[PDB]
């Protein structure tokens, strides 16, 4: 992860201020609303016909928290994303059959959610470092696909 010290530092300080429960739920929710076809993996979560239904769905919120929690743990392993997410990569491929393009879409939604939450503080340099992290995570999650 060709991350610069000033870049690593930017990611870390911002993240220390994130409410993972809220952001996770908001990220996964926006993904399902903005890119409707991603709902194909979540038929069993219930009603998702409208944005209000998606955003309020308790299983959506809870799954978002779990996803972002694993993302969070990965931010402590920025020198070894591949090794950290290897097991998860295999599961996403072998059991869940999730097209990795989904990981890129969530990345970008995540970035929009961070900007929405932090406004001013989410300056261009800070976005740039986060784009590198989100692509890094997506790439590690896809690494074990075969």
């Amino acid at each position: 992860m060709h991350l610069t010290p000033e870049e690593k530092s930017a990611v870390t300080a911002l993240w220390g201020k994130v409410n993972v429960d809220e952001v996770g739920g908001e990220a996964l929710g926006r993904l399902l609303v903005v890119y409707a076809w991603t709902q194909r993996f979540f038929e069993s979560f219930g009603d998702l016909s409208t944005p209000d239904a998606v955003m309020g769905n308790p299983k959506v919120k809870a799954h978002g928290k779990k996803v972002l929690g694993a993302f969070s743990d990965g931010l402590a392993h920025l020198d070894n994303l591949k090794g950290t997410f290897a097991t998860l990569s295999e599961l996403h491929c072998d059991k869940l059959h999730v097209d990795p393009e989904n990981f890129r879409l969530l990345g970008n939604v995540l970035v929009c959610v961070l900007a929405h939450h932090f406004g001013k503080e989410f300056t261009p340099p800070v976005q740039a470092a986060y784009q590198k992290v989100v692509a890094g995570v997506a790439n590690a999650l896809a690494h074990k696909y075969h």
């Binding site: 076809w37 059959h97 393009e101």
Partner: protein, 141 residues
Amino acid sequence: VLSPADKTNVKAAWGKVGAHAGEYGAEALERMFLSFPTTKTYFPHFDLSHGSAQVKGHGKKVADALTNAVAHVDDMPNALSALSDLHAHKLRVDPVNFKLLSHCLLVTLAAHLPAEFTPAVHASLDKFLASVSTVLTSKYR
């Protein structure tokens, strides 16, 4: 948009394909699964081994739909309507994948049609598959 010359090129090339369509569809699929393994996530219920009957059967279906689009080249959005609904509402394949299959179909045609696959025809076919992909993806949201 397809130009008159593009339409001519596509009918000519596809006419040479003729009764091999199905076979070329299946090859395009195998090529795709091997070159771009992430595409396999959409076919967990298939046997994907070489010579698989499910792969053969699905190849024919894909090839028949392309034949139909060629037969209705001036009315593609309507000729492919049903398929557009299916992809948008049920299958929900990420749009990037269409570019991958299209590439593999072009490779397949190139490999089997040495004399027809001129630069001009290559260009028209690429445009044709891109328009088909656009239609199939037009109702996604």
